[PDB]
Amino acid sequence: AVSLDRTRAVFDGSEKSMTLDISNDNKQLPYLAQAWIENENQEKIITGPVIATPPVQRLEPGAKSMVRLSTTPDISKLPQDRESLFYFNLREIPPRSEKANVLQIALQTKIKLFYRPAAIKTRPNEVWQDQLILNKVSGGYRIENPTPYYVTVIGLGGSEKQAEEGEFETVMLSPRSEQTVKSANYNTPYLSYINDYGGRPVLSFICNGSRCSVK
Amino acid sequence: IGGCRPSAQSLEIKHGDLSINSANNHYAAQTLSVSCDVPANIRFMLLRNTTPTYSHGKKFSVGLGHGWDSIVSVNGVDTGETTMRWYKAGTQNLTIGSRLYGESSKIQPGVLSGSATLLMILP
């Protein structure tokens, strides 16, 4: 019943706070909306460095509102040359059931919340994803992410369509790291990812031996 | 820019009239619709609010009160989770099932009420 306006949230460290729009799409019943933050290990945290307000609020049917994400002074303890990962949670609370013998199911939504320090703020027309490197190895590719940002890879194929249609286990690369995935060998690799806005671009690679980079 | 949109209807699995004699092993389901405008992937996880009166091994369960439990399933799985994939834009359905009692049913019937959380983790 209670929906969110995006699939991930990027918190520009240069700002003090930001907001997310939520909506009670149910037209007959009022719902309560709980919001909270979890750290990188999905452990709920209530004392920072990032918080959500209000923790709970009421939404009349069809009502629109929002949740504010703010930082505390401890936000400075985080590394400033790379992103830190948090999770935003939104759980609804339907009104008690009016009928007898009922199992109520409440929806909850969890999305990745990327804290991006001002030191690594990007230019809205910048694509750090094309810095990724694919090294052919036994059984697949060793994917390198030399950037300070997390990268969510959703596709990897021999063609554009294969990269976006092909069955692939999604993996998210932490900043400045590498990960190895199993997959067939492709003469011209194509990789798909999800960017800041939910866009799903596809990257075409050119290989120099076992080393492949963006064309 | 926003993602898939689940139907807004309230999710209530209704078992209706139930007799203290023939109440256990009952079954009732609910269907949640999800519309995505782009190919997508969603992981669904059940979480328990009401604590289970009995033990059910690996199966997920919640408490319905008065000595009664319920084994909740998603898309036919009793494990506690499942993932749905959209190979293209469109609407896909997630079914929630609810089977009653289990173990040592030394109940004390009288209007059952319970609840669980259906979590959606988005990549």
Query: B10 and chain A: CB distance < 8 Å anywhere?
Result: yes
Most B CBs within 10 Å: which of A104, A160, A162, as the mutation test of the B interface?
A104
The Cα of B106 is separated from the nearest Cα of chain A by a number of Å equal to 18
Which residues of B20-109 form beta strands (DSSP E)? 27-36, 40-48, 61-65, 68-74, 81-86, 90-100
Query: B1 and chain A: CB distance < 8 Å anywhere?
Result: yes
Please give the full DSSP string across A162-205, using - where no structure is assigned. HHHHS----EEEPTTEEEEEE----SS-EEEEE-TTS---EEEE
Say how far apart CA B7 and CA B34 lie, in whole Å.
6
Query: B77 and chain A: CB distance < 8 Å anywhere?
Result: no
Say how far apart CA B60 and CA B72 lie, in whole Å.
6
The Cα of B61 is separated from the nearest Cα of chain A by a number of Å equal to 11
Cβ-defined contact of A105 to B70 (cutoff 8 Å)? no
Q: Domains in chain A, please, with CATH?
A: 1-121 (2.60.40.10), 122-212 (2.60.40.10)
Query: B20 and chain A: CB distance < 8 Å anywhere?
Result: no
Query: B24 and chain A: CB distance < 8 Å anywhere?
Result: no
Q: List phi, psi (to 5°) of A118.
A: -55, -30
Q: Which CATH superfamily is domain B1-123 in?
A: Fimbrial-type adhesion domain (2.60.40.1090)
Q: Report yes or no: A3 and B5 within 8 Å, Cβ to Cβ.
A: yes
Say how far apart CA A26 and CA A1 lie, in whole Å.
5
Question: Closest partner residue to A154 among B10, B64, B123, by Cβ?
Answer: B123
Rg (CA), chain B: 16
Give the technique used to solve this structure. Answer: X-ray
List the structure tokens of A81.
Answer: 């040359």
Cβ-defined contact of B8 to A27 (cutoff 8 Å)? yes
Nearest C-alpha neighbor of A93 from the set A104, A77, A103, A83 = A104
How buried is A44 (Cβ within 10 angstroms: 0-12 exposed, 13-18 middle, 19+ buried)? exposed
Q: Report yes or no: B95 and B84 within 8 Å, Cβ to Cβ.
A: no
Say how far apart CA A174 and CA A80 lie, in whole Å.
15
Q: List chain B domain ranges.
A: 1-123
Beta bridge partners of A63: none
Cβ-defined contact of B1 to A198 (cutoff 8 Å)? yes
